[PDB]
Amino acid sequence: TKQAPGVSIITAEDIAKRPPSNDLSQIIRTMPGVNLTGNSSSGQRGNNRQIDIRGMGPENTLILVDGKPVSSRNSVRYGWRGERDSRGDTNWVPADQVERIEVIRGPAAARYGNGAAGGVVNIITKQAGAETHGNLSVYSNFPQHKAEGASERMSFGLNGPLTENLSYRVYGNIAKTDSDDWDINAGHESNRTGKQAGTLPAGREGVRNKDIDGLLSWRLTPEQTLEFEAGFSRQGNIYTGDTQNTNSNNYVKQMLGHETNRMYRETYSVTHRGEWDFGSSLAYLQYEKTRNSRINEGLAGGTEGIFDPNNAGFYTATLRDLTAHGEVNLPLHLGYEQTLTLGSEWTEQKLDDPSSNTQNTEEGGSIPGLAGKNRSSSSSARIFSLFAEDNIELMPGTMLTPGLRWDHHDIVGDNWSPSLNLSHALTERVTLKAGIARAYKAPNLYQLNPDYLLYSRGQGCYGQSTSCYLRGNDGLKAETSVNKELGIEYSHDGLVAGLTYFRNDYKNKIESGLSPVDHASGGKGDYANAAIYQWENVPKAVVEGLEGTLTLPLADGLKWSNNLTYMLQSKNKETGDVLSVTPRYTLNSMLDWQATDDLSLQATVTWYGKQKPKKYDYHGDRVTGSANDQLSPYAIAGLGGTYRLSKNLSLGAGVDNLFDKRLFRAGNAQGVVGIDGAGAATYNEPGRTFYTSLTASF
Ligand SMILES: [Fe+3]
């Protein structure tokens, strides 16, 4: 089945039948335990939502492609409020070239090591066969309201042998998602007075995609395969006014409709796969080079994450990410039928950022230890990792799975991530599952680099109105989480019913500090001698909720599926504020009618529960007025079909958001001077949208 406790598979069939516009996030997010959320309560860049597992935030969601980590978003400046001006890392593989997606949440994901505290999404691509196969895929959508960005997507796939032991697979994609009109939020905006009069919170960023992958699979022996692949992707945005704080200047307006960031993402990977009597071997080298070219932005206060007119033009941040992976697997007939997996891992992140480390100390006074001018462009970290997993069978149907992961981070120090997963046949129809693991987060190179410096005159300073600096902290402890999960599932003859409880106890979540640890010396006027805060480790936080699935076969022809998220708690236990803002619940329902041999018809509904904004502002003070505004529960319905003309040719068509339920980004969550808060109204919900699709394949 497509749901067990902790885990979800999305198939190619699934992707086919509920096509995403462009980014996979759209379909990935319908899994139990998954939200589409920011990393923080700020609401900053809040139309740039990413995949969240169990309310742990997107930085704790590890994206793999064919088991190889995607780190590209680490090339984007990590801001005061724990957001990046990033669209996330799910738009690198084109929808129609995906074989399947694995979503692994909580204690079952901790093994994957660094940044699987939320969970792991593994995007798996279609591979070459025995014969040569190919495909050509087209999708085009059509919003009812012209404001809203339409999407167009053309991908090709082409696979097979060339020798009896050589195979290849290639794909290409071209896609475009029109940005929402600059003014789509007009009249829904938060109340904006004085200087900040006129200003608009922005709709969805557009994106242009170009993805090209090649693989060779070289099988030199019966029991030896060697794979080479290179990947080339490019995303360039279409700007529609977005800024950290929703303020404007002239440069902003100049760029409306223009490309203001481009990511180039290049991957080369060597993968050797081994299978003999004693068991199975797998090891790879990936080199990921991300170039993040974007218009220079301010780093101070309300100037944080707006285009800086003083210093106009592009800079380029460079991420070199190097990953090497080894495992063997050993069956052991030891009384207990069991299987044993041994592994090393090595990673290096090199970050060059020419712009992030260029906040100066003129207005706030200088900081002992930190040069005010031409501070290093370099951060790096290496993690070395050992692990073993034992997959024990105690008695046919029971499985006990203990594992130890050990990580050496070359700055933060040693981590021990132990794990244990039980699954238990209570009946041939019922399985009880329980898991407790300590998952791992290495601080990001922004949080960790004491040359990385943000400044506020006071509007963004915790526990005061005076000027303050926020500084990187190479002393930081890693984030750990003890993810508990207890679940039950009935599964028999396409009747599936499951309910999981999850609680993640969240130690040393890394966040902008609350207390000053120093005061700067000198500078200008009332701003002189600013406070120094660091990135610190909040001692305790908790998330808590429920995952449900129910699948009823109404007839042979007819399948009713449901996935449930219910978010019980999300508490920073220090401040008492929320971690993420997610909907109180999420119910997805598909009806799948196999209405003929050839035709198949789909109805969908999503219910989103209430959404509540953060309680406290940047000061730690209780928010007031429209900063408290919540989002009411609402639903989104869809009808679609796939009508299959032949073995060679299939067509799709349907409607997202049948009833044109629309929402509009009013701004960020809290008030600043001149810009009333928007509470939970931080994102744009798209309206009615027709779509059509075409797949030719052999
Ligand atoms: Fe300010």
Swiss-Prot record:
Principal subcellular localization: membrane
UniProt keyword terms in alphabetical order: Cell outer membrane, Ion transport, Iron, Iron transport, Membrane, Receptor, Signal, TonB box, Transmembrane, Transmembrane beta strand, Transport
Protein name: Ferric enterobactin receptor
Renumbered residue ranges of the record's region Disordered: 34-54, 187-206, 349-376
PANTHER family (UniProt xref): FERRIENTEROBACTIN RECEPTOR, TONB-DEPENDENT OUTER MEMBRANE RECEPTOR
Keyword Cytoplasm set for record: no
Classification via InterPro entries: Plug_dom, Plug_dom_sf, TonB-dep_rcpt-like, TonB-dep_rcpt_b-brl, TonB_rcpt_b-brl_sf, TonB_rcpt_CS, TonB_sidphr_rcpt
Keyword field contains Transport: yes
UniProt motif (TonB C-terminal box) ranges: 681-698
GO biological process: enterobactin transport; siderophore transmembrane transport; siderophore transport
GO molecular function: colicin transmembrane transporter activity; enterobactin binding; enterobactin transmembrane transporter activity; siderophore uptake transmembrane transporter activity; signaling receptor activity
Any Pfam family hit: TonB_dep_Rec_b-barrel
GO CC term, one of those recorded: cell outer membrane
Localization, UniProt: Cell outer membrane
